Amino acid sequence: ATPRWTREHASKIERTDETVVPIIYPPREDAAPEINGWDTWFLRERDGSIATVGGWRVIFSLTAPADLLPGKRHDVAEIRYFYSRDGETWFDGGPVFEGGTRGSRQWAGSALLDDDGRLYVFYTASGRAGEAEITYEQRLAVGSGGSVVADDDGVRIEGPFAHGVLLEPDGERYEREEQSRGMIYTFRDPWFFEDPRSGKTYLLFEANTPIPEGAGACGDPVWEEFNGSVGIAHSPTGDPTDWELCDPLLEGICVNQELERPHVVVRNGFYYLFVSSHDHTFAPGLEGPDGLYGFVADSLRGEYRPLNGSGLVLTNPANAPYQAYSWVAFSHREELLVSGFFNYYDLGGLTLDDVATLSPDEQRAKFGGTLAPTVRVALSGDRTRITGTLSHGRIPLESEELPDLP
């Protein structure tokens, strides 16, 4: 009996002063002017803390050339890494992988620097390598056996990498491309997670739960097409490359198709599950914004209930509604910090579909492709509140003091 994000929940979704981030203004100069970057994740230790190699943090982004049309970046996404000594001033480390990477292009995942010093970069293999025309087949892959070397000058990630597919949908608990009714199926965004209570090793991902035709599982057959779910796999050995599929943590059946970049933050006794979702991926009769949605339980595989009653944790203002996306939450002392990327801004009133109308120059003019100002939020049980922001893409360590709040 999988925990459900229900239509009764989504009906309550509504922008409030506690969930709306300030307006994002473009940062004064870019770390890589030639490159657009989105969907970023942190190099973490096994426990989940941000990894530090000779005083450097490492982060990973999906990247495309800046001269490319924003709407098309997803077809040629390549994983680059960046490194920083403070958490503000990031240096471009270049592409992480030299070749032998799975899929026509790579989508978001996670990064593990294991106790043994071995590097695992989990990613989504979209399509198949050297395919004729672009396909939308997603499988959870890993580039294993990496090395992270750090001097006083910077960080280089050195090869060779052993690329292999880890998981594909079973067709019973997790929908395959064949079973996809309505929009394209999801099976992506593999996020590594060691449960600090059990010690057991898991891998979360975004999937869909298959719904048979005429299942009656919803109060209207078209609602059944919106079958988004947060899937999880287990490693009995704790080997980061050996996984068995488990039952999904949470489903948004009749509510939403895309429960994107799922991840868990554990805070005192409690498991907060966070997913980023779109306005256009909501089932008909429901109205929610592009935002970070969140749920809480007393255990990793517990009865998740939505934060703030509706599930909406954080969103953009009505007058800049696509300015950020692909938020990733992480603990810092008594605060929760949330890092998205700077998405589409200065649309005036145009919808995202309408941005494909405009001249190439006018399209690139309305896309950030940098890290958003990281949001500071305060959790209090099943309730959240925005407390303020930091500099663009500040990822601080727990050993660092943050500025005071108003």
Ligand X SMILES: OC[C@H]1O[C@@](CO)(OC[C@@]2(O[C@H]3O[C@H](CO)[C@@H](O)[C@H](O)[C@H]3O)O[C@H](CO)[C@@H](O)[C@@H]2O)[C@@H](O)[C@@H]1O
Task: Please choose, out of 91-99, 224-232, 305-313, 319-327, the segment that lies near ligand X by the rule CB under 6 A.
Answer: 319-327
Instruction: Specify whether 195 is catalytic.
Output: no
Q: Does 260 bind ligand X (CB under 6 A)?
A: yes
Q: Does 123 bind ligand X (CB under 6 A)?
A: no
Annotated catalytic residue within 175, 260, 290, 335 = 260
Q: Does 15 bind ligand X (CB under 6 A)?
A: no
Considering only 5, 19, 36, 38, the residue that binds ligand X (CB under 6 A) is 38
Q: Does 173 bind ligand X (CB under 6 A)?
A: no
Considering only 352, 371, 386, 390, the residue that binds ligand X (CB under 6 A) is 352
In the complex with ligand X, the residue whose CB is nearer, 77 or 379, is: 77
To ligand X, the closest distance from the beta carbon of 239 in angstroms equals: 25
To ligand X, the closest distance from the beta carbon of 141 in angstroms equals: 13
In the complex with ligand X, the residue whose CB is nearer, 290 or 335, is: 290
To ligand X, the closest distance from the beta carbon of 206 in angstroms equals: 7
Q: Does 77 bind ligand X (CB under 6 A)?
A: yes
Instruction: Specify whether 260 is catalytic.
Output: yes
How many residues at the interface with ligand X, by CB under 6 A?
A: 17
In the complex with ligand X, the residue whose CB is nearer, 110 or 301, is: 110
Residues 202-241 that bind ligand X (CB under 6 A): none
Count of positions (residues) in the chain: 406
Q: Does 249 bind ligand X (CB under 6 A)?
A: no
Q: Does 104 bind ligand X (CB under 6 A)?
A: no
In the complex with ligand X, the residue whose CB is nearer, 158 or 362, is: 362
Q: Which residues bind ligand X (CB under 6 A)?
A: 38-39, 62, 74, 77, 107-108, 188-189, 258, 260, 278, 322, 325-326, 343, 352
Kindly list the catalytic residues. 39, 260
